Design a binder for this molecule. Structure first.
Ligand SMILES: CCCCCCCCCCCCCCCCCC(=O)OC[C@H](COP(=O)([O-])OCC[N+](C)(C)C)OC(=O)CCCCCCCCCCCCCCCCC
Ligand SMILES: CCCCCCCCCCCCCCCCCC(=O)OC[C@H](COP(=O)([O-])OCC[N+](C)(C)C)OC(=O)CCCCCCCCCCCCCCCCC
Ligand SMILES: Nc1ncnc2c1ncn2[C@@H]1O[C@H](COP(=O)(O)OP(=O)(O)OP(=O)(O)O)[C@@H](O)[C@H]1O
Ligand SMILES: [Mg+2]
Lengths: 160, 58, 119, 256, 75, 75, 75, 75, 75
């Protein structure tokens, strides 16, 4: 039940695991992880508003167990960095819906055997282990050295 | 033996004979040359049926 | 599905006039207004048959927009005798017609069971 | 408990499964001993074939529905479907579509009553494959030397404890179901080679699998225990523990 | 009025055109199936499956038009 | 009235259109059978059994048209 | 009567359409028989019989049309 | 009026013409898919996908035609 | 007036003729792609791109007709 933001290149045309993140969430603890900025897919990959509406139906007719947990693990402090109006709207709507969030925490490791997810609070440096049953994460980015060795990037690793 | 076949409605000749030589002699020039399967009853029906994503059970 | 289709088909039979009776009354008088206009502009020969609907464009539309225009012309073309007379006229045999000869088609329509007045 | 049971003494756990090729029913029930010619009645009475079909096929079928009648007393079968049938039955003379929409909810009720009253059948081949893979059991039991002494498997009545299974506290699900669809039972086994006996207790529940709407396994052993007893050794094997299984998978909550 | 009805019944006749192409379209699909079979008769299963599936889509359009026919005939 | 009748019969003539295409589709189907047969005659039975099956579906539509033909002619 | 008879005889002319497609289906069939014969002449008689056999399925539609033709021409 | 109305329903019938060609076009596509498969059945999934894709594009035209039909029938 | 208006609607239906041939042309192109693909599947990407391009050019003529249709319908 580990899902991501893009499909690997090994999947053929007959694999549709990407579409089972929202459908196959019958029970368990769900975690939507966001990596540390800068990352790709800031707003075009936020699907925690459609899942809530689809999972609100599952609780109505019993498809989704009542003892489930969905929390948004955002490594960053704000969802939209360069737009306060949008980020304020998101955090406002997330609370209106009833979703819980945890800031300064980023996914670190995933155990495929026992379904263990190792998180770490960058603010306190305290890492924890949490059982998961439906895990979604936006693929984290990484700065390329050939752009830093040439003295082009600035700080984070973006072009100056 | 002939009564047992009649009372069990095994009225297909040579069904309970391992070597239905009489059936082979009658089918030497038959289209679709075949003999009755062993212990075949005229009432048994093993037909199956399934539904698939494609039509006609394919 | 058959239950719903068989039901709405009944409601549209029992009810239905609540929403379409206006379009039926509209097409009723409309079917009479265009018919009345056809008799005004149409070539009727010595018998009541529109034999020249292609005389002009307006005649073609008046003939198509009518209800009885198709019948008066069809019942005339189906009467073998009236067509035998026309075949004689084309060859050069023609004369005057009495009031009884003018209604030769009305007698033919009545025989079929049509309701025609003015014999 | 086995719902379909005739006066036949043999093979009670297979009576509903076995499809005989008889044109009619045998004159007498399967003999448990060699009897005398005068113990049985020659040329059984007239209309005997019909009497047997009623007491061997009809009656035990109604005893099944009566034994498990508590599983069909839901507001959907009791009030909704009969009420839906009466609403269209008042207009049955107007058209045919009303006769259909009035009989459909009755055919739907029969189907739910039919499937819910059947004896709960788990995939027994999956089970034996599971125990014969355990080494602690194969030490004393083998399929070529094992025999059944007792068998019990029946649905659990009513809703369960609303702390271990909070799923069933759903008013929408309760409208369609009065039972849980879970079953509990045991297996009394014996091995004629080693002389060992064990009681294989198990609890089942329906679970979802690999799909969104369809159930994966209607009888999933979330608790499977074996209390083995031998000449002078008593063992307790735990093939499936409920504390570890209920944390990974939850029931299905059948509707309709 | 009467003519519009006369055209409606005519449009209903036009539905027999796909019926003609469906016959030709069917003979072609089964013509290739024969040749395709003779070239590699080991794979009867897959080829045969694709035949009927293709046939389904072919006839699907046939009855689709027939449905469209009766529709315009009464609507 | 009499006009729609003249159209009813006119449509009934159109039913002979598939009757034409069915003939063409046959010559094509049997042509593939010959080539497929000359290609691998050892597998005749399989190639053959599939031939008539296809043809059965072909003229089935032909009969189907005649059905609609008489329908519109009398319905 | 005479008006409908005019379209009746006209419809009878439509029956000459399969007569055309049946000819084309024939020219195509014997073409496949010839080319297929060259590739494997060892089974000449087999191909030959299937050729004429296929042709019989062509005149089927032919006679069917003419039958249906004279029928509506008088029914 | 009624004349323009007669053409409206008449065009509505013409939409069944692509339905005929869509049927024929489908048989040809699958006939090739069969032959394309018997040649190299190793690419079932690939050839199979490419087949249905092309077929999907055909239904686009089919639905497009019908859409044009009702539109012109009321506009 | 009403006559020319009727012809305008009639020509609007004529646009469905390229739609029919466009559907048939699609099946033909993809059939050639399928067979050409099974023969050399290593370069599917090349053949695949050329396929969709042709299909686009086909719709080009399709849209041209529809454009031409509405044009004469109002001009
Ligand atoms: C007057 C008294 C009453 C008489 C009643 C009827 C008598 C019937 C006599 C028995 C013959 C019955 C014919 C069965 C076909 C036998 C041939 C065969 O199997 O085909 C093999 C044939 C021939 O294979 P072959 O290898 O054996 O022979 C080849 C022939 N040569 C050598 C010349 C090439 O091959 C096939 O596979 C064709 C398959 C299609 C067969 C078509 C069968 C259609 C009939 C089945 C439906 C009938 C059910 C009716 C039920 C009615 C219910 C109300
Ligand atoms: C207001 C009046 C009430 C309505 C009247 C309804 C009449 C119902 C009885 C007549 C219908 C009989 C149809 C049977 C058709 C199917 C055959 C069959 O029975 O299968 C049985 C089957 C038997 O099993 P099986 O046939 O499916 O498979 C058996 C498998 N082997 C062979 C291996 C054992 O069981 C059932 O179908 C479930 C029980 C259904 C019970 C049928 C209705 C009983 C009604 C009881 C109350 C009637 C009260 C009236 C009496 C008053 C006093 C006189
Ligand atoms: N693989 C199969 N293929 C075709 N039909 C099947 C298949 N499996 C079952 N069926 C049909 O479905 C019926 C029920 O299957 P089921 O597995 O529940 O029987 P079972 O006796 O309970 O097996 P078990 O003893 O393992 O519990 C079967 O009697 C059979 O008619
Ligand atoms: Mg079982």
């Amino acid at each position: 039940p580990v899902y991501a933001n893009r499909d690997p290149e090994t999947w053929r045309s007959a694999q549709h695991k990407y579409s089972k993140y929202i459908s196959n969430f019958k029970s368990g603890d769900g975690y939507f992880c966001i990596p540390e900025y800068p990352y790709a897919g800031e707003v075009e990959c936020f699907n925690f508003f459609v899942s809530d509406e689809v999972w609100k139906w599952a609780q109505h007719h019993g498809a989704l167990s009542p003892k489930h947990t969905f929390t948004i693990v955002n490594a960053n402090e704000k969802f939209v960095h360069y737009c306060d109006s949008a980020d304020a709207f998101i955090k406002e709507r997330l609370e209106k819906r009833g979703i819980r969030v945890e800031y300064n925490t980023k996914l670190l490791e995933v155990h495929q055997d026992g379904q263990k997810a190792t998180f770490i609070n960058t603010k306190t440096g305290e890492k924890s282990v949490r059982d998961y049953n439906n895990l979604y994460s936006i693929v984290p980015s990484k700065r390329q050295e050939f752009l830093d060795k040439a003295g082009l990037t600035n700080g984070n690793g973006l072009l100056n | 033996e002939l009564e047992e076949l009649t009372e069990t409605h095994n009225y297909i000749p040579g069904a309970k004979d391992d070597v239905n030589l009489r059936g082979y002699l009658a089918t030497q020039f038959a289209w679709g040359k075949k003999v009755i399967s062993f212990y075949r009853h005229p009432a048994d029906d093993f037909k199956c049926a399934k539904a698939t994503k494609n039509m006609l059970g394919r | 599905g058959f239950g719903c289709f068989s039901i709405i088909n009944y409601l549209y039979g029992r009810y239905g006039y609540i929403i379409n009776e206006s379009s039926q009354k509209r097409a009723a008088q409309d079917l009479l207004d265009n018919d009345m206009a056809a008799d005004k502009i149409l070539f009727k020969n010595r018998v009541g048959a529109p034999t020249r609907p292609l005389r002009s464009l307006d005649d073609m539309m008046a003939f198509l927009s009518g209800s009885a225009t198709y019948d008066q012309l069809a019942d005339y073309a189906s009467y073998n005798h009236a067509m035998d007379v026309n075949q004689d006229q084309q060859a050069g045999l023609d004369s005057w017609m009495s009031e009884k000869d003018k209604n030769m088609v009305k007698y033919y329509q009545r025989s079929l069971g049509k309701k025609v007045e003015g014999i | 408990q086995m719902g379909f049971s005739s006066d036949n003494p043999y093979n009670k756990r297979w009576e509903y499964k076995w499809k005989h090729s008889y044109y009619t029913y045998p004159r007498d029930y399967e003999h448990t001993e060699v009897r005398k010619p005068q113990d049985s009645k020659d040329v059984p009475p007239i209309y005997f074939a019909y009497y047997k079909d009623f007491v061997d096929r009809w009656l035990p079928g109604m005893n099944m529905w009566w034994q498990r009648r508590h599983r069909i007393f839901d507001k959907f079968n009791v009030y909704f479907l009969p009420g839906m049938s009466l609403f269209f039955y008042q207009f049955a003379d107007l058209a045919l579509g009303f006769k259909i929409m009035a009989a459909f909810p009755l055919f739907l009720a029969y189907t739910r009553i039919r499937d819910k009253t059947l004896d709960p059948d788990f995939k027994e081949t999956y089970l034996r494959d599971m125990i014969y893979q355990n080494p602690e059991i194969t030490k004393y039991f083998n399929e070529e030397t094992i025999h059944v002494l007792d068998y019990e498997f029946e649905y659990l009545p009513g809703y369960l404890c609303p702390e271990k299974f909070p799923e069933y506290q759903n008013k929408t699900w309760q409208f369609f179901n009065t039972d849980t669809a879970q079953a509990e039972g045991f297996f009394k086994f014996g091995d004629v080679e080693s002389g060992a006996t064990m009681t294989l207790k198990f609890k089942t529940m329906p679970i979802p699998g690999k799909f969104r709407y369809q159930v994966g396994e209607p009888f999933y052993f979330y608790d499977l225990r074996a209390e083995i007893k031998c000449d002078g050794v008593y063992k307790e094997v735990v093939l499936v523990d409920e504390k570890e299984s209920l944390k990974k998978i939850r029931p299905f909550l059948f509707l309709i | 009025m009467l003519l519009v009805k006369a055209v409606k019944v005519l449009v209903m006749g036009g539905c027999m055109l796909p019926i003609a192409f469906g016959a030709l379209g069917t003979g072609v699909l089964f013509a290739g199936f024969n040749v395709a079979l003779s070239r590699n008769p080991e794979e009867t299963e897959s080829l045969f499956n694709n035949t009927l599936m293709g046939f389904a889509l072919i006839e699907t359009f046939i009855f689709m038009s027939i449905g469209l026919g009766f529709f315009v005939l009464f609507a």
